[PDB]
Design an enzyme around this catalytic site. Sequence first.
Site, PDB file in Angstrom:
ATOM      1  N   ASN A 164      27.139  41.187  24.485  1.00 40.13           N
ATOM      2  CA  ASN A 164      26.383  42.429  24.527  1.00 40.13           C
ATOM      3  C   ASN A 164      27.017  43.210  25.668  1.00 40.13           C
ATOM      4  O   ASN A 164      26.705  42.984  26.838  1.00 40.13           O
ATOM      5  CB  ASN A 164      24.907  42.136  24.822  1.00 40.13           C
ATOM      6  N   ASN A 208      19.983  34.160  24.645  1.00 39.24           N
ATOM      7  CA  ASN A 208      20.603  35.114  25.567  1.00 39.24           C
ATOM      8  C   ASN A 208      20.880  34.512  26.958  1.00 39.24           C
ATOM      9  O   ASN A 208      19.991  33.902  27.584  1.00 39.24           O
ATOM     10  CB  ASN A 208      19.742  36.366  25.688  1.00 39.24           C
ATOM     11  N   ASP A 223      24.947  36.042  23.620  1.00 38.86           N
ATOM     12  CA  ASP A 223      24.009  35.255  22.810  1.00 38.86           C
ATOM     13  C   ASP A 223      24.783  34.035  22.301  1.00 38.86           C
ATOM     14  O   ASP A 223      25.894  34.177  21.800  1.00 38.86           O
ATOM     15  CB  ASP A 223      23.472  36.089  21.650  1.00 38.86           C
ATOM     16  N   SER A 278      25.602  40.372  28.875  1.00 41.44           N
ATOM     17  CA  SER A 278      25.061  39.071  28.525  1.00 41.44           C
ATOM     18  C   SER A 278      25.678  38.647  27.195  1.00 41.44           C
ATOM     19  O   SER A 278      26.241  39.477  26.481  1.00 41.44           O
ATOM     20  CB  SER A 278      23.534  39.133  28.398  1.00 41.44           C
ATOM     21  N   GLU A 333      19.813  34.898  12.666  1.00 45.71           N
ATOM     22  CA  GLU A 333      20.458  34.913  13.977  1.00 45.71           C
ATOM     23  C   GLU A 333      21.946  34.551  13.908  1.00 45.71           C
ATOM     24  O   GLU A 333      22.783  35.216  14.509  1.00 45.71           O
ATOM     25  CB  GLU A 333      19.780  33.955  14.973  1.00 45.71           C
ATOM     26  N   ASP A 377      24.901  45.214  28.538  1.00 46.82           N
ATOM     27  CA  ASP A 377      24.257  44.612  29.707  1.00 46.82           C
ATOM     28  C   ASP A 377      24.953  43.375  30.255  1.00 46.82           C
ATOM     29  O   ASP A 377      24.393  42.666  31.084  1.00 46.82           O
ATOM     30  CB  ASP A 377      22.779  44.312  29.439  1.00 46.82           C
TER      31      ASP A 377
END
Length: 130
Positions: free
Chosen positions: A46, A60, A53, A51, A35, A49
């Site tokens: 991202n 998220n 992380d 969002s 990750e 959309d």
Amino acid sequence: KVFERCELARTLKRLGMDGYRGISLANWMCLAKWESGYNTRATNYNAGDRSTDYGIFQFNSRYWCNDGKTPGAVNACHLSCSALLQDNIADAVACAKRVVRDPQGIRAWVAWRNRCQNRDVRQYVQGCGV
């Protein structure tokens, strides 16, 4: 902070992650590795959309923490996403425990499926004294 492998392993054990909801320490190590490379300040936007992380486990912003700019978001861990960028990982671990309390469990992270599931993950905790 960028954790060294065994340092992180020992830290996760002290925080009660070994076997939490049936998930072994090696699986948590494999997850953090893919990750973020064990990097607590890791962030990833991202664009598709809107969002982001956050942190060592890449939580998220649409579901786990609040950053204020993610549309239709919830904050299941009841934390500011800023809390997931600290060198101290206590909050990130508390949130990871929350994530796996849902039915999907460790499968909630697609990276775990691609890189950890059905593999020999012993190497992640080897020689760490855990």
